[PDB]
Ligand binder design. Structure first.
Ligand SMILES: Nc1nc2c(ncn2[C@@H]2O[C@H](COP(=O)(O)CP(=O)(O)OP(=O)(O)O)[C@@H](O)[C@H]2O)c(=O)[nH]1
Ligand SMILES: [K+]
Ligand SMILES: [Mg+2]
Ligand SMILES: [Mg+2]
Ligand SMILES: [Mg+2]
Ligand SMILES: [Mg+2]
Length: 592
DNA sequence: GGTCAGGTCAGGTCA
């Protein structure tokens, strides 16, 4: 059946004027207060919990323990992440039914269900609605994190930039009631406004879009020869060049916006008809040449480049950019190294003047964002030996590369992991499936690759560092899952935890070992399987020590094989958790 | 049973 209740406000319901006859009269006073609360002054200092304790009479809850149990899930909603869920069970289970006065008159057998129902009501009709009334939730796009802005200042931000967009031709109204492709959302991006579109779901045309994008990636393969895998690029470049590596990374400003629809349409028509049929060709071009979008119940045309959020703008922008930089890429200096994922260029060469020339070559052809550009060039004001590109960190001097992590200060790492799956729901009495499914290798698979475990251009100690960081991530995921077990499963009778923990350390060590042996490097000495597993456990402890009273049984059990080969490993790094992970917030508390 | 090939689901990466 269904054992999950979703935390997102999306599923909320607009409160009725009166209680529905099914629910008890008590709720109405809450409802009344809610209306009063909505009418109440919209003071900018606002805490959802305080206002919420006023509108909801405590008498509904009866005892303070019952009330606190309910406001715990309210707090969870205030601190929610995308896709997060709780068990519906938690809304009735372990509630002191003797305290609830209105329930006391009713027969005990029906008390849970009724309670459940009523609790459900108050969340969908009051809690989620009032939160949505005072606050607006926007995805940070860093993990599953959700930032809560005051509704007023978000509407002012979105309308400010909406007028800043109507004034310029970027957004016009074509006003012929043409069907909206999707709804435009404006979601803050530091300085930039990052305007995107949530397309409306179309299942009938989705296979056609997939066919189209497949054909376009095939024209990118057949023509404009693939630039090559970044791993082998870096490998051959570091092996062939012995001198100091000078490199620059540049971020194209509004890569999708500044594409020219006329040029891209006439480029789409250029494709030979056997690789793309002319009827399909015409579809591609009139799709991208006519982009119609619904804003505040109004429809507008988008005439600035490729609309972001489309199901065919990515492959098209790649087609455009890759064709457009063919001249440089086709033949450069044999010494030189260049690579672009999408909108992000990375160029390294022994000769500094060449890197300088490349910066100015790209800067003239396109308009860049100058804060995002990173280089070790002496002429630049803040040269760095470590340059970040494609979710990795390349140190040009050391020639070492390490996984890049994006953890702002005060960031709560629990956001990074999706523990709840509404399509495949685990019952509350099956904690083992939840914890296991959380610890399946697929989530860290990206970091268990050649790039991070190769020793061809990576030092052995840097291989150790990458694996240690990956295991730290795994452990934070484990701890988050444990908290989820305690918050919603609430299964106190749990001893299966250690089996999953140990099995996962074993298996991840095996995977990293098998990928490390396959991509043996010249810098490779001897790499223990045993001390790799031991490093996994020390990485765990670095995280579990953050909640040592709650975990002390487990951590003391862990301490009782940690045997660490080669003198280059400092070994201080493995005992103390890295500085990046020390300040991430592992306790959730309502900040609104 | 042991491979494959297709398909599906899942969680992660990049921009
Ligand atoms: N549909 C989506 N497209 C995206 C997403 N992220 C990036 N992109 C596309 O990748 C391109 C690069 O995005 P970036 O985040 O690097 C910033 P953008 O290039 O839009 O401009 P600047 O902020 O001036 O750097 C962007 O133009 C678009 C996404 O989450 N969804
Ligand atoms: K960016
Ligand atoms: Mg970028
Ligand atoms: Mg960009
Ligand atoms: Mg991660
Ligand atoms: Mg997915």
């Amino acid at each position: 059946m269904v054992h999950y209740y979703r935390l997102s406000l999306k599923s909320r319901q607009k409160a009725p004027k009166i209680v529905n006859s099914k629910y008890n009269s008590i709720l109405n006073i809450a409802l009344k207060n809610f209306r009063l609360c909505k009418k109440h002054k919209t003071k900018k200092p606002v805490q959802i919990l305080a206002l919420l304790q006023e509108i909801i009479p405590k008498s509904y809850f009866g005892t303070t323990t019952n009330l606190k149990r309910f406001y715990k899930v309210v707090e969870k909603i205030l601190t929610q992440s995308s896709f997060e869920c709780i068990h519906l069970s938690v809304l009735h289970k372990c509630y002191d039914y003797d305290a609830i006065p209105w329930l006391q008159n009713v027969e005990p057998n029906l008390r849970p269900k009724l309670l459940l129902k009523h609790n459900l009501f108050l969340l969908d009709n009051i809690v989620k609605p009032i939160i949505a009334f005072y606050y607006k939730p926007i995805k940070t796009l860093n993990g599953h994190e959700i930032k809560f802005i005051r509704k007023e200042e978000y509407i002012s931000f979105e309308s400010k930039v909406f007028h800043k967009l109507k004034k310029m031709k970027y957004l016009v109204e074509v006003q012929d009631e043409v069907k909206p492709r999707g709804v435009l959302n404006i979601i803050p991006k530091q300085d930039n406004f990052r305007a995107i579109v949530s397309i409306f779901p179309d299942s009938a045309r989705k296979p056609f879009f997939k066919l189209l994008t497949s054909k376009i990636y095939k024209v990118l393969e057949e023509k404009y020869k693939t630039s090559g895998s970044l791993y082998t690029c870096w490998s051959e470049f570091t092996q062939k060049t012995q001198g100091q590596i000078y490199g620059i990374k540049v971020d194209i400003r509004d890569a999708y916006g500044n594409v020219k629809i006329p040029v891209l349409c006439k480029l789409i028509q250029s494709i030979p008809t056997h690789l793309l049929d002319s009827e399909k060709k015409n579809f591609i071009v009139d799709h991208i040449s006519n982009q119609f979008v619904a804003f505040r119940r109004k429809i507008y045309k988008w005439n600035h480049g490729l609309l972001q959020g489309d199901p065919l703008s990515g492959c098209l922008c790649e087609l455009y950019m890759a064709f457009m930089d063919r001249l440089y890429f086709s033949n450069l200096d044999k010494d030189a190294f260049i690579h672009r994922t999408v909108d992000d260029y990375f160029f390294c060469s022994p000769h500094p003047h060449k890197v300088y020339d490349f910066e100015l070559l790209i800067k003239g052809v396109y308009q860049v964002n100058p804060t995002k550009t990173r280089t070790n060039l002496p002429t630049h004001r803040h040269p760095q030996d470590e340059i970040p590109y494609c979710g990795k960190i390349f140190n040009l001097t050391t020639r070492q590369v390490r996984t890049l992590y994006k953890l702002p200060p005060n960031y709560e790492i629990r956001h990074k992991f999706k523990l709840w799956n509404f399509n495949n729901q685990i019952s509350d009495d099956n904690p083992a499936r939840f914890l296991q499914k959380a610890m399946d290798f697929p989530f860290i698979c990206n970091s268990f690759t050649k790039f991070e475990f190769n020793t061809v251009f990576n030092d052995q100690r840097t291989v150790f560092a990458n694996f240690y960081d990956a295991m730290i991530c795994v452990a934070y995921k484990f701890d988050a899952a444990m908290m989820a077990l305690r918050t919603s499963f609430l299964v106190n009778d749990f001893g299966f935890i250690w089996l999953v923990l140990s099995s996962t350390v074993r298996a991840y060590a095996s995977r990293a070992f098998k990928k490390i042996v396959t991509y043996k490097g010249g810098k490779y000495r001897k790499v223990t399987f045993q001390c790799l597993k031991s490093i996994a456990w020390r990485a765990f402890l670095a995280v579990l020590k953050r909640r040592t009273e709650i975990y002390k049984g487990l951590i003391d059990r862990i301490k009782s094989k940690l045997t660490m080969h080669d003198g280059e490993v400092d070994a201080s790094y493995f005992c103390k958790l890295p500085e990046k992970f020390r300040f991430v917030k592992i306790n959730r508390k309502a900040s609104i």
